[PDB]
Amino acid sequence: VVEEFDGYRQIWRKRGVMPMLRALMSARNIAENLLATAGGERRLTDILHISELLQEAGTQLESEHALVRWLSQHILEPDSNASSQQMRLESDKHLVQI
Amino acid sequence: MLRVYHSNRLDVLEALMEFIVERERLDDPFEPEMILVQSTGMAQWLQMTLSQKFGIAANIDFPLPASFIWDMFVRVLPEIPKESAFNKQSMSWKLMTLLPQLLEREDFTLLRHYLTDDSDKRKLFQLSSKAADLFDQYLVYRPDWLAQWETGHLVEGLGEAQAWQAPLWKALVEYTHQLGQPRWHRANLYQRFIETLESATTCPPGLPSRVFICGISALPPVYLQALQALGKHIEIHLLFTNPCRYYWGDIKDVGNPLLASWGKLGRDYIYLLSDLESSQELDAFVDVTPDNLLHNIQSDILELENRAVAGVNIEEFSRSDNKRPLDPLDSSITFHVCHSPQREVEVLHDRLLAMLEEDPTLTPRDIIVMVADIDSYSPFIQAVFGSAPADRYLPYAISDRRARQSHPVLEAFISLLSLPDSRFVSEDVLALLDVPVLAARFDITEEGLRYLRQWVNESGIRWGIDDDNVRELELPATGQHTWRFGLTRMLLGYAMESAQGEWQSVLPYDESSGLIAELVGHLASLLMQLNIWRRGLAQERPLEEWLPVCRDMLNAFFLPDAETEAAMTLIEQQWQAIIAEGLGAQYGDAVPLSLLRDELAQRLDQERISQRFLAGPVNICTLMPMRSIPFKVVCLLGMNDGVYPRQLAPLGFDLMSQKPKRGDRSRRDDDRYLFLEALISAQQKLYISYIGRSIQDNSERFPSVLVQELIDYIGQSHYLPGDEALNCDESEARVKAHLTCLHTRMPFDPQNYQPGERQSYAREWLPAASQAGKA
Amino acid sequence: APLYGADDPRRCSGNSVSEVLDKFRKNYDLIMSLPQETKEEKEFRHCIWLAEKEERERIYQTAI
Amino acid sequence: AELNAKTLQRLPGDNWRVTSYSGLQQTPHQFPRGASPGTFLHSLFEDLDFTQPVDPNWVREKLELGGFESQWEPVLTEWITAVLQAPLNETGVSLSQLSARNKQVEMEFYLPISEPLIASQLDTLIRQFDPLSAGCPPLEFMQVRGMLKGFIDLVFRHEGRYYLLAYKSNWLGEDSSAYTQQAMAAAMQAHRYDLQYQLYTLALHRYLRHRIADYDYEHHFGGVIYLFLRGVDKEHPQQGIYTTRPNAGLIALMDEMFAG
Amino acid sequence: AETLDPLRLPLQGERLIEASAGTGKTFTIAALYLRLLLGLGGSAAFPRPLTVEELLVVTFTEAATAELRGRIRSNIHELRIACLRETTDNPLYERLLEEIDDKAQAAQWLLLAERQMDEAAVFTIHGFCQRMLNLNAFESGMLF
């Protein structure tokens, strides 16, 4: 596990943010298990949205630690008014619209 | 003689240039070849092609039309300065001085109401900049107006704002005569330059043998007149990419709707070219065989014929045989509807992989991807093209992205310039300490920052560097929760244990007690500096006094390194250039720091890096005018209604937009013509994508009007096999629905993995789509 | 390609790029030596080409 | 239903690329050194007029731009003259003797490489025709097909014979003996400037063959001149300058290799 | 209070149109937009025909603004097709064609409108204020 995380760190340094998370989800089969688990679809959608936001925030931030610092800061004070931070639709299927 | 070369494609013009260069050789070897281009990518492509053909391309100058015409001014007429006195940069600072002296005038009464409430000359500077831009545009496109304004008369039948614009320009000229600067500017110089060569018995010395104008499809009428006057002595070869074979400028609406709508930029240009008296033109076109949908549309555009059927007659509206058969397997033109830009790029990657697999001859360099705004799609493009596996890896290079060489140093310096206005929040100062250069300057290690975070937090530092800063904001002096308070507290805690008690109504901070407290001594060294400068930058200073400010601040606050030296040099160069323009304009009055800071902020990010346009990998870049290069695969992203075309409305008091003439340029028409250039340049495949439904709200978006007209023309000009019995409208809707592809919202949707042409290439989401995982 | 002006060495219209390049290459000196065309002649040639295109379109529409 | 993703039969190729010599490779003595000082020293000659004596005010303004000490201004001017008046290869050309018509500064060239350029298949020829390459270990780089870029410092013609001049501001040593012929050759071998000037000569030969009607290599070419700014001293004519002429056979075989 | 007929509604000065829910208030906007573009109604018509860029529409929400822009685009397209074909399957377009004098010039104007629909002046109150401040910063006295 330490070795795979060290390789993930190398991928993170080289190819950016999204490649590391993608390789992690592929190797750990996170998406498959979440889709299998009841309700995990919303979880996977939120994870993907968080990954996209982390990529957008790491593009501007050159330091690797700065992205973690920014993520912790945003977790401390979530901005509800932000349109980007709005939660996306759960599924494209038929949903009761409240 | 001025020879105009017409060709539907660029490669023909380029080969003609090749043959002309090879046939007639330059006598002197060191004489540089002249090729006019308005874009760097066009020049780079020309160089790469000429080197590939001849064996090497060198000593080929690529100046802009304006700079070239100014160079010709310098050589043909004597007593002309190297650089024009009237430029966009200097007129701003000159009008900044001239406007306060003219507020007493009645004609400027409205301007008075504008300049009444300004405190730090913000409105004055912005108005001067806008007026300088307007005057430059007038110089370029409207010399008669300036010629009339200099004498003091008014132009009949013009805009209302002329009343306040005509005298100012006059008051400018006289002003630049008092300082002693050269009177000559291009507007008055045009007629004399034309007359000197018109009556010249022989060719003047120093002129180049021949000139080339390649890739420029838009020129002002005055430049064309100057080139016509210059064509007598020296030959000029204009390579003009013409989308239509026949005469399509002011046809004696154009015949083709897709050309009439998007051809406003080229109609005026071809009408000007036709109006040249001493021009000899030969047509070198290439016919296109209508074997594909894209080739069919290109042939319709080239032949200036209309293929869509309106259906006015009942017999015409009933049968669908009037349209052209469309092959179902054909995929030359394909429209794609996605949900998010991430999904859009992820689908574009798979489509590019499919196109590469389908055709062995295709190469990544041939493919090009153009987006409305490259900065909005840069993270998604980069992540999608980086996450691809090694066997699936596609090389990419992104062009026209904002030039960001060292962002933290730039932002730290910009924030340091705002010192007098800053409240010195603890988080803000820690953000300045984030930069490793500013910390190395005060030998603050990265491990020490973990300690200084909790120290600042627990000690109680909230805002304010000292009590004087608190009193300066007209707030009651408290004496606590300031940087001085926290520093004194930490020092007392290093000196005296907190168990003893208060000494000066300040509880010592026990945490900083050992050798680590030396960090405090370094931190207290920073703030003191932050104090000194925050007092030095308050007072307004003349321009010559602002010269050593930037260098002193950099060498005081920053300790350079191998990487940061470049950014520091760029900052110094921009600062020195701004102050040099100011001093050349002889601005006497004092200038506040808030003006130079906000000017440097605008000047630093205006840079762009397009050096990797044709590096070899697939090209990612925005749509830039005057850059038309043929490519096999041409993809277009971000075509949502409102994003493209990009709308930049005029200032509102410009006189050109009131009574427009032929040759006037507008960003709207520029984008409308770039969309046509993208269509014509596509040789094999055209890909167009746009966001249909918002991923967040599941709402409905719309595509650009251009894509709408394109799909309308397609649906009205073609019919699928087996739909002959159907009427025009049903067959049109069927074709439009067959070509428009609606992709899924999520990558793990199993529809993506069903066998077909829409089948994806990413196997990572295959087990998820198959629903084979365990809970 | 328009029928009018086919004999003129200036015109290089062809079916492929290579044919156009050869057509231009063979008659380069002839093109250069020819004097410049008058404005009236250029307008006349453009009008003739437009009329030819119009007549072609009319004949096609009659064929429908 | 059954789901299967597609596979790629043909792998896309990254062979096509555009690279430079850097990509393939991968008192004045006490003057500060670095990337920025070197670029400043080069920009000085970029806009310097050789046919006129140096002006103290211009040097002072350039030192203000660079940010160096004004104390260098009295000396640097003299040093610049030492560069302008220093003699050259046996023709005895002085830099001040070059007029604005017989000079070309910072010429950018593009050279196509059609077949993939292998280090092994080139190093053998370079070692065969150049002893400096024989002294060094074999070239090592990956296959490259595409374009080659480069910026030539100066090209000038004298007596109807052309030359190539390349400025170098590397601090070879602290003493003048470190700027001798053997030491300069050792530095060339260490920084692999041999391949650099070879490619420069290939580019120049192709450009002259293209431009000059009835061109001949032996007749019109004059050799290669590396100018070490700090090495230039009025006392010793040899220290600071280096002159080398590539073999015509090497140039011809290199041209044929790069063509096909 | 009088019943409303979109074709006979005079467009001069201020006019108030009040009705209950689901009565087609938003739907009449398209008919009035077409009338303004074509300049129909005789006495009740505007004195001169107008362009897309001169008609202002103010909506409450952004989504409704986009919906109205799309629907106006679609109505312009359908009316242009009807004018080209001189026949239509909708009663409103049928009455319009009955009111139109010359259909070729009307179709040309509708084509120009379709081509300028990208610049349609349909905004919200806050967006209208922002755009008027930006376009006229000189008169309003704000920054550029």
Ligand SMILES: Nc1ncnc2c1ncn2[C@@H]1O[C@H](COP(=O)(O)OP(=O)(O)NP(=O)(O)O)[C@@H](O)[C@H]1O
């Ligand atoms: N004259 C008409 N002919 C046909 N359908 C109509 C007509 N007027 C309105 N409709 C339809 O009526 C429905 C609602 O119309 P709408 O314009 O939203 O009314 P409304 O006054 O805006 N309701 P509200 O927005 O809640 O105040 C839509 O489906 C329209 O197509």
Ligand SMILES: [Mg+2]
């Ligand atoms: Mg409504």
